Amino acid sequence: ARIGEMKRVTKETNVSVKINLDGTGVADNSSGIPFLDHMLDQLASHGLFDVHVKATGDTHIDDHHTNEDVALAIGTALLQALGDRKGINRFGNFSAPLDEALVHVSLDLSGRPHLGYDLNIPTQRVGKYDTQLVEHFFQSLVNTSGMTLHIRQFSGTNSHHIIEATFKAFARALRQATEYDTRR
Amino acid sequence: ARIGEMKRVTKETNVSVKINLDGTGVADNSSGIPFLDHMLDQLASHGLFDVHVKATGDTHIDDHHTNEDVALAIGTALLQALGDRKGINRFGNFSAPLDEALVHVSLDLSGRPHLGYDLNIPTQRVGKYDTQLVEHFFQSLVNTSGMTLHIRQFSGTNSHHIIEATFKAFARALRQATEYDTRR
Amino acid sequence: ARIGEMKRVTKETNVSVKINLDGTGVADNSSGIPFLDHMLDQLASHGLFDVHVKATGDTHIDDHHTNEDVALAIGTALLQALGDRKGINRFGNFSAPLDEALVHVSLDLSGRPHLGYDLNIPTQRVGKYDTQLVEHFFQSLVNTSGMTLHIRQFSGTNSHHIIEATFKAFARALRQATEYDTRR
Amino acid sequence: ARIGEMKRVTKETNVSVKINLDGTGVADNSSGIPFLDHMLDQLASHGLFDVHVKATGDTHIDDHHTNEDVALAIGTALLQALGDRKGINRFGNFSAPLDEALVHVSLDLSGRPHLGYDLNIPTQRVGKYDTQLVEHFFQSLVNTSGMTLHIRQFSGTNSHHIIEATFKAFARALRQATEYDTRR
Amino acid sequence: ARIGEMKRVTKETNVSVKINLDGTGVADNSSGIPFLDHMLDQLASHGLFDVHVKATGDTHIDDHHTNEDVALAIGTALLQALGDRKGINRFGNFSAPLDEALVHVSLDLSGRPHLGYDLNIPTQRVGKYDTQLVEHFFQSLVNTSGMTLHIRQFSGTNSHHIIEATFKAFARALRQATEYDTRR
Amino acid sequence: ARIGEMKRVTKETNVSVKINLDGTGVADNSSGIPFLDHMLDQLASHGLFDVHVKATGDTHIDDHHTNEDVALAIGTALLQALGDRKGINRFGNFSAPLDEALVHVSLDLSGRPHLGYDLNIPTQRVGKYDTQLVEHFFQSLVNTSGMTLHIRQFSGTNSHHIIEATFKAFARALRQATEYDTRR
Numbered sequence A, B, C, D, E, F: 001a002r003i004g005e006m007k008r009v010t011k012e013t014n015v016s017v018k019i020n021l022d023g024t025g026v027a028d029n030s031s032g033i034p035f036l037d038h039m040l041d042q043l044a045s046h047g048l049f050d051v052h053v054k055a056t057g058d059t060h061i062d063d064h065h066t067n068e069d070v071a072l073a074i075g076t077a078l079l080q081a082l083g084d085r086k087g088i089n090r091f092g093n094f095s096a097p098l099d100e101a102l103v104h105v106s107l108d109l110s111g112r113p114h115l116g117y118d119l120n121i122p123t124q125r126v127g128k129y130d131t132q133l134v135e136h137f138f139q140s141l142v143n144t145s146g147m148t149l150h151i152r153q154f155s156g157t158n159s160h161h162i163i164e165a166t167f168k169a170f171a172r173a174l175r176q177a178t179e180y181d182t183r184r
């Protein structure tokens, strides 16, 4: 089983993260940000990873520094879990709906970081969560993990539906790229 | 008296609902969402139904899952109260103002679900309540009850006035369609 | 083997339907509408289902009531064949060409009905079949089965080619979503 | 193992080609055109075919006649390797990135030739290779093999990145369509 | 060492301020406004001033009166610390980035107050802090200190990044203008 | 003296690089690309670094793979030379002309990679060198070194003048950011 780990402490935040790439979908996510915990459960449920996050930070300023440090920690742990990368599929591709929304995702585990982001989120807040932090989460994840990632919206109107469909399609495309390629 | 009931429990919410179609306007509505309780009182007061709702949920994420599960429960209870549908008017139609706002409603108790929605709500929050949830409430209600519904705005500026006039006109059109047609 | 059945008789039509989700591609389709029989054979041939339809109706008015009642019967039989839905893939996705035409399909077996339809069919009749009935067929199927469905055109000019490519891509995406997920 | 062969000699060129559809990714490509050799290596590496090309021609006029005759020879050898086409998947579909570029490919091994081409290459030369020859290569390949092919660009800026991503996505979609379908 | 002081009490607020122009970067900032404390720490860290603020006010109306009175107090203390202004550089100029944002600042310690402000902040709230108060802060500071100030945005998208880059560039330009000019 | 080193060998290229941050302007640059050697001499001459590059590659395809691998090696060696980064200026800023051209540069040695690129180069080739490789050079350098970089054109017409003025302004801004800050 490919298991990666990371711990990071600064003057703003304290973060611990653990990821299993050959899991059964166990989730235990307790950051300081309740809506982000709901999205990280989708990564376990539709990708079948084991995911565990614990974090405390400076949320009386805002949620920005806690959102950034958690995303950096997940990228580092994924790069440690993958290792040599011998014998994997390496590419993944999927489109996923939630009622009237639909999002398309493709990625490549290349060693070269890049983000292409093309979403149109029509409100500024979902509950207490700020909607500019969705794009900042994915940009910090690709910088520490070294992946090429493209995200593109086909339709949708409700803001809760659009974000949750992104995290569903991302989970299924990442599951495809990390599985072993039994050859032709 | 035509009385319908429903109870639904999931990992997000716990909901109980009871509706009387031949009532005197008794209201007892205690969801977790205070502005939605104020709108459900209009359904009892202007339609003369008896309406009772009790709900608890996961409102520290947001109000979305609690708003959706309550609406599904009301649609199921209405379909159980109606039964065979022998001898009713079946169609209803009404327009209702509140100061400078005016909304037109027509519906048909057909067995075929459809929503046509045409409102223009100019702010994002009324009190703590999110304004995209008005359209999600009516879409969940027509899917479990099987009704054809059309809603169209003629004028209006204040957001509180526009939503409360929708729930007034809906109540008077539903009262017309469920009453017995003493024949010509 | 997951097998679903339905019989419906009204003052307009008489319909019998049977579907096997673990089939070998046996087709026996005899509605009153010859072009619709040719499309239902594609569902058996490219999805590997067993499909059987028998229908008579009031085709001297037009084909509308017979087209609607057959589609409702197929949705009910699919919902009975699926049952609990334990252990399936649940999502499906595919794009299919026929000469110069190309159509993209994605779906989710959710319990929440919705149709997104985006085709541009350039003539009014193919043989004797009316081209507005393509959209009415898919809307009746999602209302009884409870599925989320999105259909989108990428290119194409000939009307026979565009409709037949829709039914090919739909068959391959439905085969993906009903198969058992041997886990990671 | 399905192996196809072809030899063609005219007053312009001399060409020999050999392809294995059940290979391990062995490449030995020596045409007179160095950039085209680099693209043919991608077909072996990402599709897992065995590919061997040897060619000499009249490259002091230009590269046009050598580029056309090699493409015709590959189409003939693929049609000989496939034979009866009993029991294959027959359809294939994939999207592939390279940094900021992304291209979508779908195809069908039908017996009816057609090309849909939609790329936007922003310079006239990559090294010594002329960029109008990319479209001429794919048009000659579909005429001798008899396949339906669609190619469409989603993003990209660098000319080397756009062409190499086309040959990657084409390789993965062709691998899907030639594999045996173990039935449902 | 050039040290300036100020105390101001009204029926709205109570404010105490102390600034050292020849400091080592010691910060002790406790206003009633948490996001403004985070920006005042940047003034100590990148300009190497010693800065100390203590304030209480009427924040149950809003943050406006507390934001205005703190800014007036800082301008007065800077004018007392500078004194005669013999032998200083008097002018300062700097451009500073933070990820995708970039802001240009130039100023002159002239005795004539003026503000030129050209920022485009795309949301209304960062955490609890209102974004119209950024411009009101700088206008009150130049009126009591008597400085000419110009602020201009070159790029940027995230609201937290744009404001924090303004306070970084302002700190480095003010450090340049208050240092002693060892002559040519 | 802060000295960094790197050696990288792949199936495309062979590269060796050495950089001194406290140098006297000694240059010894022998890649396979003659115009790129002329630009690397500007980095020694105007920034006062010592720079040494040796490379061989696959330039009969094109110059792309050799241009990319050299840029990656320089970024790694700079990150090794900097180390802890205690006591440096960390920011740099400069604008530089060459006849009718003028380019503005600012950067920050942050640990977070980002490139903003805004040039308009009016021809496709300068000598034998391809002009799309200027942007690819700077993107590979910021990914291995972890710097924030912004480049913006103010005027210019001749292609040789525009590129050489970029490399002059970059050299003077990097010299500023790596020097020791004798404190205030």
Ligand SMILES: O=P(O)(O)OC[C@H](O)[C@@H](O)c1cnc[nH]1
Pocket: A160, A161, A164, B064, B065, C110
């Ligand atoms: O079981 P699902 O994966 O379909 O989860 C849907 C839930 O009800 C909830 O996550 C949701 C419903 N609408 C937005 N979010």
Ligand SMILES: O=P(O)(O)OC[C@H](O)[C@@H](O)c1cnc[nH]1
Pocket: B160, B161, B164
């Ligand atoms: O008695 P009414 O039905 O007219 O209720 C009006 C109330 O004052 C209140 O519901 C309201 C007034 N304006 C918006 N809402």
Ligand SMILES: O=P(O)(O)OC[C@H](O)[C@@H](O)c1cnc[nH]1
Pocket: C160, C161, C164, D110
């Ligand atoms: O064998 P296929 O699946 O390619 O069927 C094609 C048939 O010839 C026919 O269905 C058709 C050809 N053009 C439109 N329809």
Ligand SMILES: O=P(O)(O)OC[C@H](O)[C@@H](O)c1cnc[nH]1
Pocket: A110, D160, D161, D164, F064, F065
């Ligand atoms: O190993 P890869 O498949 O990612 O090959 C990338 C190579 O470095 C090279 O083919 C390339 C890099 N950029 C354009 N071409």
Ligand SMILES: O=P(O)(O)OC[C@H](O)[C@@H](O)c1cnc[nH]1
Pocket: A064, A065, E160, E161, E164, F110
């Ligand atoms: O050390 P820095 O000056 O780069 O501070 C950056 C911090 O992480 C934080 O202030 C920040 C990061 N993004 C916005 N704010």
Ligand SMILES: O=P(O)(O)OC[C@H](O)[C@@H](O)c1cnc[nH]1
Pocket: F160, F161, F164
């Ligand atoms: O001495 P300089 O730095 O001005 O170098 C100018 C040279 O003549 C040469 O590099 C040049 C002149 N025009 C373009 N390049």
Ligand SMILES: [Mn+2]
Pocket: A064, A068
């Ligand atoms: Mn940030």
Ligand SMILES: [Mn+2]
Pocket: A160, A164
């Ligand atoms: Mn949800």
Ligand SMILES: [Mn+2]
Pocket: B064, B068
């Ligand atoms: Mn919902």
Ligand SMILES: [Mn+2]
Pocket: B160, B164
């Ligand atoms: Mn009211």
Ligand SMILES: [Mn+2]
Pocket: C064, C068
């Ligand atoms: Mn109808």
Ligand SMILES: [Mn+2]
Pocket: C160, C164
């Ligand atoms: Mn046909």
Ligand SMILES: [Mn+2]
Pocket: D064, D068
């Ligand atoms: Mn030709």
Ligand SMILES: [Mn+2]
Pocket: D160, D164
């Ligand atoms: Mn290449």
Ligand SMILES: [Mn+2]
Pocket: E064, E068
């Ligand atoms: Mn004021």
Ligand SMILES: [Mn+2]
Pocket: E160, E164
């Ligand atoms: Mn910050």
